[PDB]
Amino acid sequence: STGRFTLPSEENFAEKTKELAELWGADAIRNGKKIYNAYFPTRAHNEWITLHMDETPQVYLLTDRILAESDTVDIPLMESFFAEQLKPNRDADPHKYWEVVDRTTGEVVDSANWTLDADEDTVHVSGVAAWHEYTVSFLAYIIWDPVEMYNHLTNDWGDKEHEIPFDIYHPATRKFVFDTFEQWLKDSPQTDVVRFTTFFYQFTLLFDEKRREKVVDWFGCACTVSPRALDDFEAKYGYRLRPEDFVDGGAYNSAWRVPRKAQRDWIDFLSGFVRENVKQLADMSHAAGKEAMMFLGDQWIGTEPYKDGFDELGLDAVVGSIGDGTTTRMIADIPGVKYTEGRFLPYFFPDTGNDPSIEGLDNWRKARRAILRSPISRMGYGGYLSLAAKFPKFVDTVTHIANEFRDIHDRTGGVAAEGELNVAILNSWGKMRSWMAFTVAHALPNKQTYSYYGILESLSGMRVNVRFISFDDVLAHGIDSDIDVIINGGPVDTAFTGGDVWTNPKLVETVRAWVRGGGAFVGVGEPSSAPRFQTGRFFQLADVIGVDEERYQTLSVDKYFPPVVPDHFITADVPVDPAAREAWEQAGYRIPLSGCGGGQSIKPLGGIDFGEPVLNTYPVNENVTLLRADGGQVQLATNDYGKGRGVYISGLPYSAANARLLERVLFYASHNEDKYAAWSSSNPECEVAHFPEQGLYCVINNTDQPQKTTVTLADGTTEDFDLPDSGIAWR
Amino acid sequence: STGRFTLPSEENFAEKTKELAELWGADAIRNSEAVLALGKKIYNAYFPTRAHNEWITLHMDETPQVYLLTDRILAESDTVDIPLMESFFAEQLKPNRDADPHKYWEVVDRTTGEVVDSANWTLDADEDTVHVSGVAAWHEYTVSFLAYIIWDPVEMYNHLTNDWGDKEHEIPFDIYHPATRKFVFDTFEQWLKDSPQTDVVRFTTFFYQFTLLFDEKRREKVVDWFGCACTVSPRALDDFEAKYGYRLRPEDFVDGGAYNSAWRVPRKAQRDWIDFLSGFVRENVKQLADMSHAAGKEAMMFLGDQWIGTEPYKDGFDELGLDAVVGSIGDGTTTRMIADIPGVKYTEGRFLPYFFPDTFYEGNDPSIEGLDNWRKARRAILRSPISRMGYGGYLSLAAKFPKFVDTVTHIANEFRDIHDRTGGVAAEGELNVAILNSWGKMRSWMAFTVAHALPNKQTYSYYGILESLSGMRVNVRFISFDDVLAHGIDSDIDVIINGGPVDTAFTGGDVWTNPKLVETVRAWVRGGGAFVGVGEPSSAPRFQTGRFFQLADVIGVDEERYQTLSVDKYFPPVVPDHFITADVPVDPAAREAWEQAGYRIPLSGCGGGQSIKPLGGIDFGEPVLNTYPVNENVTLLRADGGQVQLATNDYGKGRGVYISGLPYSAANARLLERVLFYASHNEDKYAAWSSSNPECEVAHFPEQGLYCVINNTDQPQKTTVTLADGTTEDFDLPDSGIAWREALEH
Ligand SMILES: CC(=O)N[C@@H]1[C@@H](O)[C@H](O)[C@@H](CO)O[C@@H]1O
Ligand SMILES: CC(=O)N[C@@H]1[C@@H](O)[C@H](O)[C@@H](CO)O[C@@H]1O
Ligand SMILES: [Mg+2]
């Protein structure tokens, strides 16, 4: 049990620093061991940026919609934005760089028809149509670094000076940053690892007039424009971006949107620029005898750790924030670095009286099921070490975790567990957004995302191989012959279902043919959906999965539901209260009634949490197998399709039960039922990792209980376990 | 107290007929001898397009026809075979082989939408199968083909439902064909002479049956009470082309599988077809009426069955000279369908239950349904009187239920008494409310219907708006977008309601991307109008990334469509004490739990201000997911489960209101009524002629110097009625009761 652990520094508590590093087998100290220093290339020099204020990052902002009540309207620029963070750019010619849109028609208002007030941040529009809504899209300087701003507001730093951010796209600021880092390196001989936190462009993070978050996209590049960059883009790509190409009608190019060419063009542009400079920073670091480590977050926009070429940056490490299985996978699967690191929870900060061991062991549980599938090299925590030395139950929690971690490494050699199936998530983005589907705010699923995010989180720690593919991959090269299951999920008209790509007959031909020949297709929520393309067919692959969504176009056609099959391989681990099942059996099915179809269960069978409902799903014919069809619509179904199978699930919030459901779905759909038993846990609360090349397996408790489970080995025999609080057994 | 009441009768029942006719004050008798002596008006049912197999079996290419769409068949190579009849009831439907399939049919690649070249497919000589070649593999294919209708849809329905098992299937006929038309008219002429004792010809109905197709399992496959599917023929299709200057594709009927549902945003081809069919139906209905009148008889049309093409709410209906319309009283809404029809001398309700062994069986109590049906109809009747009432089915069946019999005496007496007191004049409406959709007046009271009187999971959240309004103390009209675009909004309108799911006739679909529509409604609201939006009002997909409900600014709510998830949504605190919710039953245990849990703290990418626990108390039916307030100045009244159900917004002089759904109930009708008075800035007008208790309603008759208060339930209800002058009266109303009082005569 040696090393692989990163411990954060403390102001003066330099006494227990030697004792806790010895107790935890620590080999690195954050901020005779390895030393990490956080570097912040775009802030922490107000002495520079105040003298060149037009070199701050900038962003297109969309004003509120203003109603015109005659042929003129006044549109205030800053009324809905935090004036401490953002300020309208009056230097760059508004009539050149801004755009007033009539949102009612979609037409751009002619620049002869509007002016910027000389003394107020107000736009005067004349010659317009009464009773239309009008917005301005304008450039704004970001005069306060979004993350430092966030920490300021969160910790209430009061009147502490606001860090002004700068943009290395301007040659003067770029020269300053490199000169400074050179000097910094010279002045930092003790530092072993430069922890870049992060680089050049903050992810979209804008605040409103009430000091609240207004707009956030962990992947967003709102905060990446300036007049020079926009003009250079035109010179390089051969057309001019509209402000609309960034404000996106109010959507701000959310990753949920079906990606437009303009967005891809901008990503490529930004990425060439960011990557060359990151490499320069890594080179300088290495030339000084130091390692370069990137933080996966904050100013990470334009790095693209999952695009090809990332390796050529020559970064030594990626370090990332661990909130769960999915966010662990984001870090763990990154190619082209020497090692990876997770900053585990809880952070060492007062708001975590309480038993802090619980969060720490829990954060470790969501992460460890993922680490088993895709190991991370190192672990650690941030913050105030004095604040946690005070909690003796927690210190012992960490000693255990650091040792379990290394024991895992020492048993497995950092090798990943064996995957029993090959699963592909199919969406508009593919590999570049590996493990990043459905995310808005990092680690914060919500009402609108959690029914889909649950898919990734289920997969993150599952005994299968997961890969991320795009509709472009499938159209150019077909479906790789080693894939067992394809998954398509999300709401209609998103990047994650795909939108109008589904009206492209080549795509449909390719998937249909592959499933007919024995492939497996799993649709979640509104899979393969295309609005208005066919009057009687919303899910374009409805025939594959046996389920469509009624969109109020087909109410005249009676829908007939076949009887639900309660005893089935897929649902075999769902406990049902006998009295629930009894009620469901007793009430029976609806009798055909004019205009109402028939066969829908009068009472629900239940037992399963499906998240957000997809209303009026129905079976396409009576040969589709219904597994849950409660409340007059369909939540779970399966269909045979030539040699292959399609499955529908309306939604899938993460839980052990739901992860087991999905796993069973994956083995069933790819006709691999008899392959399921080997290396399985009978208890859904527990999970098995098989390491054949080492002749070993482990079984883990996903919880802080005692859990009883039977593991089935490949040779048919069974081994029983009684697992203590988040335990781990090895055979 | 006698009259306005139609009595069913049968053979060998002269004595009970006589007694019950006397008991109920019946002035008319419906056929199904000695009974003829009584001096009552005599109704006889007539069925123009059936009951004559001896003719039609000799002229089988003159049965009505319909375009049918086969199942989607997957091609797995460059050829594919399509069974025409495997999803259809072969006892009802037969592919039409006589009329050139290559002229009249279409094979469609559903995966591309492309019509398959007529050269690339053949109809098998021996099997009902189409063979197709030169197709793309992995695409889905269908055939749209003409089928003869060989069994009368309604007679069939009844046969299957009543287990008639054995008897001959009645075959329908289509009068578009000159020979069949002549048969029908010669036969009606002969019948009139053979029926001197008949006073009222009760046409059940006319020429074209509403869409009603069955599947290979003898179940209903496709129904639309306003549907035009069963109305085609090669001749008619060809005549249409000549008249309108373009050929209808089979697609113009099958509609991708929708079959032209009234819920579909109407296409020009649909409207042309109606106009075409209606000219022809109306000319021939008129002849029947004229022949009836010349024989000294009245002509009465059943609002149902073969009524397609009569268009009772379209202009000109009065020119048919029909004396009466009769319809099934299923509820308030279906009562209004009948009552509001202009162009006839009188209207008639056929009440429930029907005298049949499915409800008149030992152990059942039909008087409960009988009185229930009366209650539901009576609240609508006060707003729009119908002239007459009656029952159908077997009298000898109802005669065995003395409790039921005594309930009828009560209903008959009450019906007549409401008529005598009000003189058949509508109660005074307190606001003018306009329902706005693609159809307008021609579908007055017909919005949200699929099968008649059968609201379901998909429709009840919107049908509830009509049922609420059907008996409400307001004037209700139905207007179209075309009316609005041509003439603006009539100045007498207080409130406009726009309701339904996105991309339907009822919300309006892309009409909402028409600047002029948006201009007109906005300016009218700003100048003091009221806009009430239900479900997905003013919704237009894709048009604006950041705006789904085009009038979100008016009503203060939009729906998140996963395009705007980077924008945090901030909900202002809910206001539980409001005019609109004033009559909602309080659950202090719900209210205190709600207050206790409080509101979500702003969280990154999750917005904030959403109540952590539901307030509840109101059934809004089907959820509209992820509705949210557009700004923090919108008034949230219900916003449970991280989305919005009920909200109001000030818009200049006027107001908008959002409601996610509205299943009918006393509580919900009262909530709507309150929405209407509030949104029109008419709170001060609300009290006058109102019942404190939502289970009761008030009808005012200024010109008779009367008001009445009615109990809409079978329980006793006490209520306090506020009069115009501010004075009040208390009432203890019995089970289903009515009370009358004097008011100031105007
Ligand atoms: C990995 C990552 O980008 N983390 C950031 C964090 O630095 C920041 O404080 C927060 C603001 O809400 O957003 C994200 O959680
Ligand atoms: C008013 C009207 O057209 N009623 C018909 C009824 O005659 C028929 O028996 C039924 C079949 O489902 O459909 C409708 O209810
Ligand atoms: Mg001025």
Swiss-Prot record, chain A:
Q: Which GO terms describe its molecular function?
A: 1,3-beta-galactosyl-N-acetylhexosamine phosphorylase activity; 1,4-alpha-oligoglucan phosphorylase activity
InterPro entries noted in UniProt: Class_I_gatase-like, Glyco_hydro_b, Ig-like_fold, Lact_bio_phlase-like_N, Lacto-N-biose_phosphorylase, LBP_C, LBP_M
Could you confirm whether the keyword Calcium appears in this record?
Answer: no
Q: Which Pfam families match?
A: Lact_bio_phlase (PF09508), LBP_C (PF17386), LBP_M (PF17385)
Q: What does changing Y347F do?
A: Strong decrease in activity
Effect caused by changing F349N: Decrease in activity
Gene3D superfamilies assigned to the protein according to its UniProt record, in alphabetical order: 3.40.50.880, Glycosidases, Golgi alpha-mannosidase II, Immunoglobulins
User: Quaternary arrangement and interactors, per the entry?
Assistant: Homodimer.
Looking up NCBIfam families in the UniProt record yields: 1,3-beta-galactosyl-N-acetylhexosamine phosphorylase
What this chain does, per the entry, is described as: Reversibly phosphorolyzes lacto-N-biose to Gal1-P and N-acetylglucosamine (GlcNAc) and galacto-N-biose to Gal1-P and N-acetylgalactosamine (GalNAc). Involved in the lacto-N-biose I/galacto-N-biose (LNB/GNB) degradation pathway, which is important for host intestinal colonization by bifidobacteria.
What protein name applies here? Answer: 1,3-beta-galactosyl-N-acetylhexosamine phosphorylase
Provide the organism lineage as a comma list: Bacteria, Bacillati, Actinomycetota, Actinomycetes, Bifidobacteriales
